[PDB]
Design a protein around this ligand. Sequence first.
Ligand SMILES: Nc1ncnc2c1ncn2[C@@H]1O[C@H](COP(=O)(O)OP(=O)(O)O)[C@@H](O)[C@H]1O
Ligand SMILES: Nc1ncnc2c1ncn2[C@@H]1O[C@H](COP(=O)(O)OP(=O)(O)O)[C@@H](O)[C@H]1O
Ligand SMILES: [Zn+2]
Ligand SMILES: [Zn+2]
Ligand SMILES: [Zn+2]
Lengths: 410, 379, 179, 188
Amino acid sequence: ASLLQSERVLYLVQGEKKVRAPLSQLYFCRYCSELRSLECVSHEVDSHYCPSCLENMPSAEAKLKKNRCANCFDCPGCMHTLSTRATAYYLACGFCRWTSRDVGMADKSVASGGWQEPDHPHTQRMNKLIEYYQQLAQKEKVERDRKKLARRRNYMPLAFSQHTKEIKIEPAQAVDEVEPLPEDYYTRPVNLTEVTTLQQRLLQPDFQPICASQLYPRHKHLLIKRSLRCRQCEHNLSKPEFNPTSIKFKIQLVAVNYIPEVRIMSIPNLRYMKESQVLLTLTNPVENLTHVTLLECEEGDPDDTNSTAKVSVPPTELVLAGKDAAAEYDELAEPQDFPDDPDVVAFRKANKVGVFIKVTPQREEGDVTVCFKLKHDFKNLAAPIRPVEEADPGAEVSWLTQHVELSLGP
Amino acid sequence: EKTAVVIDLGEAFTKCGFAGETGPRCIIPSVIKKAGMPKPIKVVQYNINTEELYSYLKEFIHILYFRHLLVNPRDRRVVVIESVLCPSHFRETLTRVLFKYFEVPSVLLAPSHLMALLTLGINSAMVLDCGYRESLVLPIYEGIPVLNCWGALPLGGKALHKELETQLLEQCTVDTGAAKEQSLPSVMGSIPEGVLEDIKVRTCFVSDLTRGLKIQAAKFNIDGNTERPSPPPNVDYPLDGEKILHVLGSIRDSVVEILFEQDNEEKSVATLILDSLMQCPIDTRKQLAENLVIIGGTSMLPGFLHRLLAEIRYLVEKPKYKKTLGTKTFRIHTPPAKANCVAWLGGAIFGALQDILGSRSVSKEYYNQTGRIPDWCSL
Amino acid sequence: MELGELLYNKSEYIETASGNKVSRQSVLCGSQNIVLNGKTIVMNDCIIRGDLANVRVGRHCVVKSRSVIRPPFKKFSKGVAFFPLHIGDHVFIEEDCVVNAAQIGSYVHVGKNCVIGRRCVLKDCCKILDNTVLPPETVVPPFTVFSGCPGLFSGELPECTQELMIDVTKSYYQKFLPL
Amino acid sequence: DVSRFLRLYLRKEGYDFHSSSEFEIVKAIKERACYLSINPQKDETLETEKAQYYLPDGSTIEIGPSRFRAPELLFRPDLIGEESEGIHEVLVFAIQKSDMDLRRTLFSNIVLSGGSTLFKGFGDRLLSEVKKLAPKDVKIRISAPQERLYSTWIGGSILASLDTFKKMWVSKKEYEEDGARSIHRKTF
Ligand SMILES: Nc1ncnc2c1ncn2[C@@H]1O[C@H](COP(=O)(O)OP(=O)(O)O)[C@@H](O)[C@H]1O
Ligand SMILES: Nc1ncnc2c1ncn2[C@@H]1O[C@H](COP(=O)(O)OP(=O)(O)O)[C@@H](O)[C@H]1O
Ligand SMILES: [Zn+2]
Ligand SMILES: [Zn+2]
Ligand SMILES: [Zn+2]
């Protein structure tokens, strides 16, 4: 993904918004015939979990607990998951040696149950204001409803019947003179250790304190398990109910697991001329493909193009064997030996075929970029078939063109 | 119905959380770390192409709705707090991102000043908003914002950060750790905005009116021989590990004065209240004066509220404002949440009102049909 | 380089046995307790100490040069002892990297010159970036990237790591041959 | 006030003119590019060209919809929130306040003066806005001179030249003897 530079050769997406992304990041949509990007697809929320103590919490409990773990804590000074140490328990960090004793929080007899965050200072005033505005909003709703049904009736405010407990909040008292800056600030050395930085100030927003002794450790933030759903298609992919300590997908779907992935095996000279060898591995068990197209003339956004890649080669039938094969186990005649193609095809191993592209570098100053279209026989299986019961000839016949953009090192 | 989310996109920091809460859940720098870019690009930028702005806001809102808040965007409503006279194309884009990409049920474009008034409970009050870009004031009288008597000056965070950078480069004394124990000037051509902001918050403070008025005349040096008050002690600040910048005591209490300096025009952060209040209707004068509100993170700076209220009462006695605003009692309101998170708290208090929210707010079905967001400009 | 893995020619001196290749330059003081079941690679000047260990490594494990894998000591009131670490399947430890980690999960790409702290657990399908410090007793979830001197959540990985990482470690092993 | 309200709309387009010097170039922007639409609602729905204006420094600014919806506040000052009649209203009200016999002749003789009538399509809008308020089938002639800005002075220049002016003005010795009223009583 990162070790090999997947962020070089990119695949194009069809729709409203055109995007150039690596095949590793993209997803293939099986309901229809069009691969779509992580940007294009809509995101959902499945499950919440703590990154320290991996515990799958339900959606209801998260809303009550404000998307936080009760047991785990993150240090305020540096941003790292704290650890309980005994002597009878105090909270301490590994990276920085900030303790819970420093700020002056008393040690608890019970390990987890004892620790808590103080109640918000303006929580009582809050509820009183909500209830005042709630009652006041309810009056406007009744007024707006009464006005709307009178318009809908269209009786011109005809008086058939006779027309027409209060909550009163006291408004906050305005101070005559606000407290001045203490005379300590004048003629006193300022230790930058004692006062807190903006980053660690703002992590505790309810009462962001200037001094470090006031700054208490906040609960550790819960992380999210994303599930993707498309515009046209319904489902796409999702994750299990035990995503904590699991790398399994409930429905595995990705562009590399359907569309044939292209990789630049060899990179030649960048001095005005060369011959680059690229591989075209298949992922499907049995299929056919072809890199025939030259991306037309000024069509399909070929603005990035800074070279003329010929790739004048007819289709080559490659197949993947999901099994541990030996070094040159058997030599097939019709697949390998019959299309010898010594100039075009470099090598043909198991689920692998090297192809020579004749690029024209140094058309611009530098940063050589090549546009070429790749075709493949997509066994869609859109119609109802149990273990390939249906023939799926019309599906296999369908030729899907992916506009690839390979970027040479330069 | 579900508890509607509140977002407040600012140049420096964005406030995020859920309605009917004591304060915002997440507050973070309004930036995004794009691959290739060493410094992260700012998400809100006025006067750029729509497509480039659309991509930045799409990237940012995604981070807010998944990494910071954990909730589906399509399920529950939005309460977008944005200041009055926010650029047209920016607000149009922000809504278009929420309605098209995320497919939110309904957005409510509340003005920050009217939201700040709800938190106190008082129906009428003057509201000063000392933000990053511009320090804006807007009188709110019994629910109606008075756009006629608006006021704005570029004396916020950005103007203060720039002033600090200028002063530090003049009196530049850093200990690199390479025979740089001796005072070394301007080793680095520019100082990054992240450092300048941290220096401002920790080192620099707002002086008293009496001491400040002397500092103004001192640096001017208006036919006087060393008429400055005794500064605080010099604070040593680390830059990128090894390099230790010695911050001069004069810089700490002089950097702030650019806000409260008259500069001939008679245009300070203090004057902007009195300039607006004098332009207000004659009946509204005494009610607005008595109910002052000071929001924005720039006013959090230590001893700002005392200097402002003092500087007001001094500028009152000045002959221009002496006639109209002579015998007026200026009293400041202390909001429940902190000065930075007053704007957000209003939107949450408003978001808790499910019945009024749905009616006032613009539904997606209306936007998809029309493609016209309602504004204070003509329809 | 552009998806394709590049050639690396090894010298004559290297201990090739049952698929497992271990550079003779690289000392592994404590050969008894350390175990390499699969076709593992250990590059030159690397350390795998047997300080009361049980260092089990993967099928296609890779450890680049100047890199150390030492077990951590558990500060227990009952008895202070070195906790035996278990490197997962298809693990890629990058060059000049320090590892004091207990239980490193399968299909992981540990970055270059990155110090992992004492008693540090890593779950499967994660990636630590280069010049990063994971503090002692930290956990990293699957499909995650931890970075910075603090060592905290930077973002998420590509969905296809389980399938992709197999190609990387196996290709490197296959491409890494004698001159 | 139109210059002040244009500055507000220019900040709503995203261009600040905070300085007192920068207020002068807002007055220049107004004077250069600001057209009064006959129907304001139709021009708002229509997508603007966004005509570029060049500043003294050299920088370009796209004004867009602020161009036409700024001077509209003359004809409809309730939009911003200023309690006034309006330029179309004050003209009609002034005629309607006068005696019934003169109304027809006063509608038949209207003269535009000053600089805040030179707005492009001012006469076109005013004629339309006056007609609907004024009585039906009444002849409304809004006779603008070519020198509207300098009309007030030219009048004084003609008045001053006449021998009657010699009688009208107040002498320095008259002001010393008569008192303060001298200037007020001779005014008319
Ligand atoms: N707690 C604080 N203490 C001191 N200064 C602060 C604090 N929070 C923010 N600031 C400063 O004041 C500014 C407040 O800007 P803010 O109101 O968050 O942005 P915006 O005006 O774009 O909504 C910040 O840029 C920062 O420089
Ligand atoms: N060509 C013009 N187009 C639009 N507005 C103009 C034009 N010329 C002047 N103005 C406006 O009219 C003002 C001039 O008013 P003026 O006629 O001098 O008033 P007075 O009659 O009191 O002397 C300018 O400040 C400007 O706002
Ligand atoms: Zn689809
Ligand atoms: Zn936890
Ligand atoms: Zn810490």
